[PDB]
Amino acid sequence: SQLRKAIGEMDNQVSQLTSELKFIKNAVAGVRETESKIYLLVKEEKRYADAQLSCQGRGGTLSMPKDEAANGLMAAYLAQAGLARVFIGINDLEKEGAFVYSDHSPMRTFNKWRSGEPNNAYDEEDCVEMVASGGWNDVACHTTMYFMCEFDKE
Amino acid sequence: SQLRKAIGEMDNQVSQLTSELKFIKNAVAGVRETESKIYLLVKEEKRYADAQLSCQGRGGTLSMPKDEAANGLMAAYLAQAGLARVFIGINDLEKEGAFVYSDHSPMRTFNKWRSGEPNNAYDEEDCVEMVASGGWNDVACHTTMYFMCEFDKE
Amino acid sequence: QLRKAIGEMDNQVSQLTSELKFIKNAVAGVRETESKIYLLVKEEKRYADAQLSCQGRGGTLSMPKDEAANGLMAAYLAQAGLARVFIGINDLEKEGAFVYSDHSPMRTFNKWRSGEPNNAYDEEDCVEMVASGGWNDVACHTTMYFMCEFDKE
Ligand SMILES: [Ca+2]
Ligand SMILES: [Ca+2]
Ligand SMILES: [Ca+2]
Ligand SMILES: [Ca+2]
Ligand SMILES: [Ca+2]
Ligand SMILES: [Ca+2]
Ligand SMILES: [Ca+2]
Ligand SMILES: [Ca+2]
Ligand SMILES: [Ca+2]
Ligand SMILES: [Cl-]
């Protein structure tokens, strides 16, 4: 009816917001999302401690590739941005050789360590980076680089 | 019934956009918001004149802490972002010692001047910075640093 | 009662539109005409990679086909403090015959800088825009920032 004219504009209005929001989310912010989690590449060079705080400030933590799918998405995300490396949510700060995720959940069978890694170079590497290939590498926590945050859609 | 379905689907859609828009504002853009104002930290080093112009171009002005609540929000904002200092919307450009806000409104009883400030060091300091503590300090206007914009929701 | 609910839904939608407007303009710093949206991507890439990146977001390298579009892009560049960016013009497949990223032919309107295009050393088949807004042909293997254009359709 006559309200449908006003309402009909609203179907278009709501539809328009959906399209533009998609644009902002994808084309502008360049964010990645699965069915349960959202991933965000933050292009600010920080050390591991500051990177984790930044992720927590946004309501998440450093990305935690616990399976093949998550790691692959993160790798593709890295590739398209033309980045060589980012911090991720893996470390062995609390006990050398004993790696855990940022949520303190234990490391498991799945991993993407590059050959020879983790090697704890110079006995000063307790944090983990992901390279464009998707592989993992332990590095010094005082190292400065970009990082990626993970958000649970809960 | 189909009309009830379409309406219910549009309702979920509107709810989804509300949630996604909220995520972008907080997790991605990292903006701070009260009931009347929005605050945006711009991480581009500029001089005071350019900072104000940039804020005006976005439809706002350099932040104006006119009460303790606003100053506290801005201070926490700086802290969480890991910044040491930012330009804010306070100056005494037109008359030495006569400080005004970016909207040309006069300085009042409330202030957060650090001890000894404003001191007009070397008679060359007519702009104002906020440090991580929340305190104010006058500095040279040709100084380059990050800045914070304020937007009126009406 | 139904008209009240409709009006209430209108306020919610208008509010969402307003907040979306704020993010798009005040934060992202995107530029927009009545038909197109422009986005400055600050990642140094070569022309082929820049174009691929633009299509990956659902658009293409900017195509200033009139004075208004070209002026907007220039102001965008000025505001971003950039000296140069890749844009959607080239003569890769045929020398001297420049086309836009949509394969549309070159026309009367242009913003070539004085003396351009010169095809310097026979290795310049792509186009950059400088801060003034002028165009200059350059080598496609050059690496620089670029600007993407999106159709509101
Ligand atoms: Ca160690
Ligand atoms: Ca170690
Ligand atoms: Ca290593
Ligand atoms: Ca003075
Ligand atoms: Ca002074
Ligand atoms: Ca001072
Ligand atoms: Ca050629
Ligand atoms: Ca040529
Ligand atoms: Ca040339
Ligand atoms: Cl370390």
Interface test with C, best of B4, B11, B21 (most C CBs within 10 A): B21
Both structure tokens of B111: 């202030």
Rounded distance from Cα C45 to ligand 7 centre (Å): 20
Kindly list the residues from chain B whose CB atom is less than 8 angstroms away from the CB atom of residue C13.
Answer: 14
Q: What is d(CA A90, CA C125) in angstroms, rounded to the nearest whole number? A: 46
Neighbors of chain B by Cβ distance (3+ pairs < 8 Å): A, C
The whole-angstrom distance between B57's CA and the closest CA on chain C is 8
Both structure tokens of A3: 């309200």
Q: Which of A17, A54, A57 sits opposite B17 (nearest CB)?
A: A17
Alpha-carbon torsion angle C108, C112, C113, C119, nearest 10: -130
Beta carbons of A103 and A61 less than 8 angstroms apart:
yes
Q: Is B123 marked within a binding site?
A: yes
Q: Which of A10, A21, A46 sits opposite B21 (nearest CB)?
A: A21
Q: What is d(CA C42, CA C97) in angstroms, rounded to the nearest whole number? A: 29
- How many other CB atoms are found less than 10 A from the CB of residue B104? 8
Both structure tokens of A27: 């084309």
Burial of C99 (0-12, 13-18, 19+ CB in 10 A): middle
Residue type, B40: L
- How many other CB atoms are found less than 10 A from the CB of residue A117? 17
Expressed as residue numbers, the domain containing C35 is 1-153
Closest CA to C143 of C38, C41, C49, C37: C49
Number of domains in chain A: 1
Q: What is the CATH number of the domain that holds B66?
A: 3.10.100.10
Beta carbons of A148 and A87 less than 8 angstroms apart:
yes
Residue B53 parent element (H or E): helix B48-57
Q: Is C122 marked within a binding site?
A: yes
Pairing of strands C126-130, C135-138: antiparallel
Q: C-alpha A16: how far from its chain's center?
A: 29
The whole-angstrom distance between A54's CA and the closest CA on chain B is 7
Q: What is d(CA C51, CA C109) in angstroms, rounded to the nearest whole number? A: 22
Neighbors of chain C by Cβ distance (3+ pairs < 8 Å): A, B
